[PDB]
Amino acid sequence: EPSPYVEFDRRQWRALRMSTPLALTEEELVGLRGLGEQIDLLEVEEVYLPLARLIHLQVAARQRLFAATAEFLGEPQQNPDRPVPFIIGVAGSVAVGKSTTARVLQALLARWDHHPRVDLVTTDGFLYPNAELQRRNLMHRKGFPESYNRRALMRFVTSVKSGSDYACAPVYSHLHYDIIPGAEQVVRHPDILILEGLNVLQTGPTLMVSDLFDFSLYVDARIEDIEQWYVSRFLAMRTTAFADPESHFHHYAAFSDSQAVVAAREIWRTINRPNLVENILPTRPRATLVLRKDADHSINRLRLRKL
Amino acid sequence: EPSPYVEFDRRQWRALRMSTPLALTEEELVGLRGLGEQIDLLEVEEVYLPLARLIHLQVAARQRLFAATAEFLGEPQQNPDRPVPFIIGVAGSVAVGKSTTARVLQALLARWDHHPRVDLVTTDGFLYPNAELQRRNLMHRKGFPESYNRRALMRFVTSVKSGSDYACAPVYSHLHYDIIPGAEQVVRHPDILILEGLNVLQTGPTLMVSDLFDFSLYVDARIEDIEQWYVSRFLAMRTTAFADPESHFHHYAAFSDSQAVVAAREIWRTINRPNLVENILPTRPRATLVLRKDADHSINRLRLRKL
Ligand code: NA
Ligand code: NA
Ligand code: NA
Ligand code: NA
């Protein structure tokens, strides 16, 4: 039966790498990966290099599109020193590795032969402040679509892809578990813009940020493996992030393996899992490329949208 | 504030026509339009000609996209005697004129300099048979998303855009108000495929037909004007379609202006209006181009998606 997708195993996919240069050291990859991630230069060579190739093949191809509409509208050319920004979305569950994935993707694309301006924005900074969340009785649905100012987010991405000289996004603090007063992330007409977050691929009654994506990525894995990673990582954070007295969750540092596991499973069950099942997973069908990870965080299978 | 769209009045839009040839006679336009429509060669010149231009500018541009993915996959070129079919969706309410719009669009694009294979398929043939509708208790929601076999529809469009030599779609009879046993509409690798129906722009938990559109059109107008047109047309059909004894709604032919109006308003209120408000309108934001009609069926304003 005909299909919009085309599956791959790491073997089939690593061949499409061709002669793409690996411009990332071991020290660099390290500072890009998160606690728990297993990503190594090998995976970066057999998976991220092909992806980066495909993306650049499409950055140019995509420009042909806006160019047509430009020609149709009888308008000028485009300052080649300012084309239409290529927007990439990276979606996935909490703890599946998407943040690392987006950080690595930005590193590789920015180090491309001509040195493109590659900006990365996480939807964290678009969550509503804790105070505003409490007001809406949402302090327990942090990460759900409604916990974000999707309007500000949409204005942000629209602003950037429309050619603005610069746009601003709030900044979120994982240490304080809240939006930081007065903080700003300024993005100035980048060549590429990667947007990473839980529900970026979301679709709805209004034009949304996913409708502005020229390419999308969905980091996938089994719901139980992600729970495992989540829990495991919660325990690990007792000696890293929670160890810090300034941490909103410093109280967690003193938890025992047992009580920490229980606490982690509860947050997963009451928050992260529901959101994954109800909002995130339903968006997967639309991803240009899905990176499937095995229980060991290893990306061994990919699903690409040819249609 | 930045915007994904760009508005136009007929004046601004007719200028983008450039020197596009008008290859349609008065006799031809007539056999393409529906009862109640006011479309004339002027509107076809100041509105449909520009649109046809823009579309052909993008058919080629769109091919650059699939070509990139083809080059990336290290696969052959594409029999230029068989590129990737360009899929166009035309959405809108019952009685807004979309069917005429799609019929005219196919006539103009098919008569393009190189003579493209331009096929047109209405979602009618994908409604579930009356018997199946009754089974699902849906005989009163005919036209709502659930009243269609969206799977068969998706398989159909996927089949065609994936390069199949031919695909088949059931046929619907407006005379009998039902799907015709054994009837088939065969579509063989067209250059362009126009899909017209109520909820074609719909989006959801799964990859849908709207995700395969390279271009979309949404014929729009005020909910009350469409009700007016609907009713008015119901009355008019007493002497055309309902006059036929073989008609499922032959009983309507004997209705008086008064009782016919009442009947028409009731169907609109209980069926067509709700569907428009709940399913159709929410899809409008996503249309590449929205054709706004005034109470006189006249297209005088357009909204194009530049992003
Ligand atoms: Na996190
Ligand atoms: Na994040
Ligand atoms: Na109709
Ligand atoms: Na129809």
UniProtKB/Swiss-Prot annotation, chains A, B:
The keyword Nucleotide-binding applies. Pathway: Cofactor biosynthesis; coenzyme A biosynthesis; CoA from (R)-pantothenate: step 1/5. Its EC number is 2.7.1.33. Keywords: ATP-binding, Coenzyme A biosynthesis, Cytoplasm, Kinase, Nucleotide-binding, Transferase. ATP binds at residues 92-99. GO terms for biological process: coenzyme A biosynthetic process. It catalyses: (R)-pantothenate + ATP = (R)-4'-phosphopantothenate + ADP + H(+). CDD domains: PanK (cd02025). GO terms for cellular component: cytoplasm. It is an enzyme of class 2 (transferase). SUPFAM superfamilies: P-loop containing nucleoside triphosphate hydrolases. GO terms for molecular function: ATP binding; pantothenate kinase activity. It comes from the Bacteria. It is found in: Cytoplasm. InterPro entries: P-loop_NTPase (IPR027417), PanK (IPR004566), PRK/URK (IPR006083). Belongs to the prokaryotic pantothenate kinase family. PANTHER family: URIDINE KINASE. This is Pantothenate kinase. It comes from Mycobacterium tuberculosis (strain CDC 1551 / Oshkosh).
